[PDB]
Design a protein around this ligand. Structure first.
Ligand SMILES: Nc1ncnc2c1ncn2[C@@H]1O[C@H](COP(=O)(O)CP(=O)(O)O)[C@@H](O)[C@H]1O
Ligand SMILES: Nc1ncnc2c1ncn2[C@@H]1O[C@H](COP(=O)(O)CP(=O)(O)O)[C@@H](O)[C@H]1O
Ligand SMILES: [Zn+2]
Ligand SMILES: [Zn+2]
Ligand SMILES: [Zn+2]
Ligand SMILES: [Zn+2]
Lengths: 562, 505
């Protein structure tokens, strides 16, 4: 065994953020709007750093895809192209990789030339994903063997993404230890884990599992930082590398690179002959533009700095080692110019007009009456539900999960791109015939998942149904105070547990995802006459808008949540 | 390349160096015969491996605990006879930990057989560190073949004594992850040597891919055939079982009974693509030709004579799955040495409610034990002639009272007074005959609380009128398990831990 030094460069969770995005910092004492990220800055910085450092190891810790129109419109081909241009050594699968099913994942993997690793996600032989990735790789540096293992988060993928049933998932901690243990007898004492299990689970692995030296993290989107970054009031969660001792007393380093192509992590690691890691360099590079520097003027208006105030702002950023200004890569610039111009072209198309008041939607408004939300919660989800109700003509009632609607819906023109921003998942519409008591329970299941067990995106809003609920469950464990269904006489009347209703919803929750346990029990059980309408979600919405000139926005969500 | 493998395996010999007696149905008559013993095991292994191409010789775990050969030699006798058999691989079972990490080391030090276990992983500062590997790879006619070791988890952690510095991982997850990782080393032929038990190994076969053969230990099941069924041996399954994994590939699962009684013998052909097919399947029951006892008309077990004996032997000699009078010189010599040593020091000094206390003393986890009415090492075996093992159920206090009611009923009304129950960690008065029942943490019993209850294997079955046990038996909700801890050893431990022990009043 010999000692070796590695230069780890990594990103994670870029989520199809190919362009820079806006963030706020505290610079020279003032809240300042700047632009950060974009894949051009990422590839440029990776290219420069890798050429400067010995033994570069370039990693992407997962969730390359989903989150912007660059995914929705181009099905992952845009992301594959920019990642190829980055010449990453390895990519691990995240949870959102499965958001569009095995088919969706395949469309990313076909054009991707980066080796893919995932040890706890294993496709059956009949899967279209069979032989598309390996559990680990071994590469050699200066004579010595180093192993790298891939790992994915399980529950969030299985419960809230859409992996095919022919893809099997295994416990994160056990997989990490079994993999690492097996690698030892191949003469290996230097082991990297490229893990989308999230910071919480990766920290648990560092504390409970032996033989793993560095855990490059994805899924939690945490900025790991330093005093420089803290001085700018960036959202620093942890120091960049956390250092733990495993049960054998060996150091384990854990780190993430924020998200949305904002950061390139830069960790220089020295391994002793016996495989004990130590840190030689540690820099989270925040990728920032120098072009946007806006501060509120004396009137309260965001205005670009000018004159010497601007010079001072720029000069301060230049003085920081963890800030990287105006990186850009020509090859990546061209790729992004191509897709961006096609995206802009598509947005030229107006599909309709909404009048009136803005309809709150997106993450912050998923649950009514919470901090960050508003008293009605996701009116935009109620609106989408009304849209499904109308185009499913014969239905008594529709339910849509708040996570299925990705933004506020504002008055004015609605573009083709807006439709695919609100509804990016490509679900078809689905219907069941089910009794009133079952409708009540599916609402309970969804709220339990949204409020306790899983994702806020589960929170349910409906059309032709309205309800009141409390955060705090009561005696018999229930949250529902009352539910009413619209008599299609046009009068609202209490739901009765024993009548059979035709219920419309999207195919995602229809399969039991997002904790819609009842729906999942009904699925593939003739007794409930489930039917895939094959009507695509966004296409159906565009049709709705074309058939409803000047649609008046809703001002309530059909949910009263205490 | 296609290759042919000849698997030869035993499991759960549990320190049975000597043959032991069993009862078979031979020519229509209940016949006592001697089976097993490690001389016969090694002899049959030596002969078979000489005969077959590409032999792989395997021990599926629980080498130790069960007889005085363990109590007195602490595993060195076992290592010696195993070394003499030249096994290719040994996997750890649950009883390997019955005397803690230090006790396992007494087995592992003299043992020369490579040890495998993928889901039992010691920390660096464990005295067990680097004493075994998770897997091995061997070459046959150019092809790589992998073998993975595996142990049962909950049973070992809960009922044995692995050190806190030994970490256990899920059986199914470990099997899939190990097999998945081996694929990219160019391996499509994988053997799983697993003490996870037939039930778990059968679940693995149907839920895990890339594993072709699962050589089993822990359940002590006889896998046999029609020959063996005609002898009324306790054949649970056909040798071997065959399943399809999720990829549709064949998986073969087999066990070799227990207590050195059987050498399993499976010829397996692997296609170039690593798909297994069976070319030979024979569970060899190791039997003596010397003991053939049948009850005479006066009710006494007596050796067969004349033509009756000749026909009994002719039937046995005609069975492919019966192997008569195998014995190996090297192993004989070793067993002779240990046996005279054993007879000598089984005379040395070690230290119904009382027997109940020995059982309670065995497992730290039991809340109470019950035992029906019916110092030196020999002083323990003399006392306890039925050869019961400790059996446990997880059951409601109300069911505990009912078994007590059942037991007394049967002793008081249905005649058999051997049924009258006494216990440790529980006490009662009975004038429902039960007036009060108490359990120690002495509190009144709680009908709603679930107690881990231990008893002898006989009564656990539903006998002596223990109806409630009978209904819990093999009824999966009550977590019934035969621990395979002998009643005689329980007594002996009771005297050891209480070397100087003042007597109950
Ligand atoms: N096919 C689909 N249809 C509807 N909603 C979906 C969906 N796939 C994922 N989601 C929603 O997306 C949520 C998960 O992502 P979150 O939006 O909470 C995290 P992130 O996308 O902002 O990184 C799920 O709980 C679910 O509500
Ligand atoms: N394997 C076993 N374990 C515990 N007790 C057993 C047993 N086999 C038989 N017995 C006990 O022996 C009783 C019957 O034996 P006998 O009654 O002929 C002798 P005894 O009771 O007069 O001494 C049974 O009812 C039962 O209590
Ligand atoms: Zn993410
Ligand atoms: Zn993620
Ligand atoms: Zn056993
Ligand atoms: Zn066992």
């Amino acid at each position: 065994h010999k000692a070796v030094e590695l230069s780890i460069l990594h990103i994670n969770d870029h989520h199809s953020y190919l362009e820079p995005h806006e963030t706020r910092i505290n610079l020279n004492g003032q809240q300042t709007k700047v632009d950060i990220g974009g894949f051009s800055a990422v590839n440029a910085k990776l290219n420069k750093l890798r050429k400067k450092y010995k033994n570069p190891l370039v990693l992407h810790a997962g969730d390359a895809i989903t989150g912007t129109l660059y995914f929705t419109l181009f099905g992952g081909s845009a992301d594959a192209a920019v990642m190829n241009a980055g010449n990453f050594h390895y990519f691990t699968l995240g949870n959102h990789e499965f958001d569009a099913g095995n088919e969706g994942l395949l469309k990313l993997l076909e054009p991707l030339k980066i080796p893919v690793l995932s040890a706890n996600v294993i496709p059956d032989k009949s899967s279209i994903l069979y032989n598309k990735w390996k559990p680990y790789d071994i590469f050699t540096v200066d004579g010595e063997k180093i192993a790298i293992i891939g790992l994915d988060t399980v529950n969030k993928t299985v419960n809230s993404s859409s992996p095919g049933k022919d893809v099997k998932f295994y416990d994160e901690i056990a997989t990490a230890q079994i993999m690492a243990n097996a690698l030892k007898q191949q003469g290996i004492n230097k082991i990297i884990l490229l893990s989308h299990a999230g910071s919480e689970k990766n920290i648990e692995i560092a504390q409970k599992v032996n033989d793993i030296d560095v855990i490059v993290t994805g899924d939690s989107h945490y900025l790991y930082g330093n005093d420089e970054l803290r001085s700018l009031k960036l959202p620093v969660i942890y120091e960049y590398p956390l250092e733990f001792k495993n049960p054998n007393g060996e150091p384990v380093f854990v780190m993430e690179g924020w998200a949305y192509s904002a950061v390139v992590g830069d960790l220089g690691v020295k391994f002793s002959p016996e495989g004990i890691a130590s840190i030689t360099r540690k820099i989270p590079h925040v990728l920032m533009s120098s072009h946007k520097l806006q501060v509120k003027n004396s009137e309260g208006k965001w205005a670009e700095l000018t004159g010497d105030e601007r010079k001072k702002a720029l000069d301060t950023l230049k003085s920081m080692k963890s800030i990287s200004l105006d990186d850009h890569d020509a090859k990546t610039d061209k790729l992004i110019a191509k897709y961006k111009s096609e995206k802009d072209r598509l947005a030229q198309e107006i599909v309709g007009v909404i009048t009136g008041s803005a309809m709150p939607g997106g993450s912050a408004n998923r649950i009514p009456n919470k901090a960050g939300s508003n008293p009605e919660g996701s009116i935009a989800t109620r609106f989408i539900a009304e849209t499904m109700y109308n185009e499913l003509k014969t239905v008594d009632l529709t339910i849509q999960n708040a996570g299925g609607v990705r933004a506020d819906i504002l008055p004015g023109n609605v573009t083709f791109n807006d439709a695919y921003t609100f509804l990016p998942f490509g679900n078809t519409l689905y219907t069941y015939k089910m009794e009133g008591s079952l409708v009540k329970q599916v609402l309970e299941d969804a709220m339990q998942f949204a409020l306790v067990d899983g994702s806020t995106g589960a929170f349910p809003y409906g059309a032709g149904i309205r309800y009141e609920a409390n955060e705090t469950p009561n005696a018999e464990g229930k949250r529902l105070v009352s539910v009413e269904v619209l008599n299609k006489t046009q009068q609202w009347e209490p739901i009765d547990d024993n009548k059979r209703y035709l219920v419309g919803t999207n195919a995602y929750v229809a399969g039991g995802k997002d904790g819609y346990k009842t729906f999942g029990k009904l699925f593939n059980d003739p007794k409930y006459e489930g039917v895939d309408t094959y009507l695509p979600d966004a296409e159906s919405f565009i049709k709705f808008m074309k058939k409803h000139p000047h649609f008046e926005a809703y001002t309530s969500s059909n949910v009263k949540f205490n």
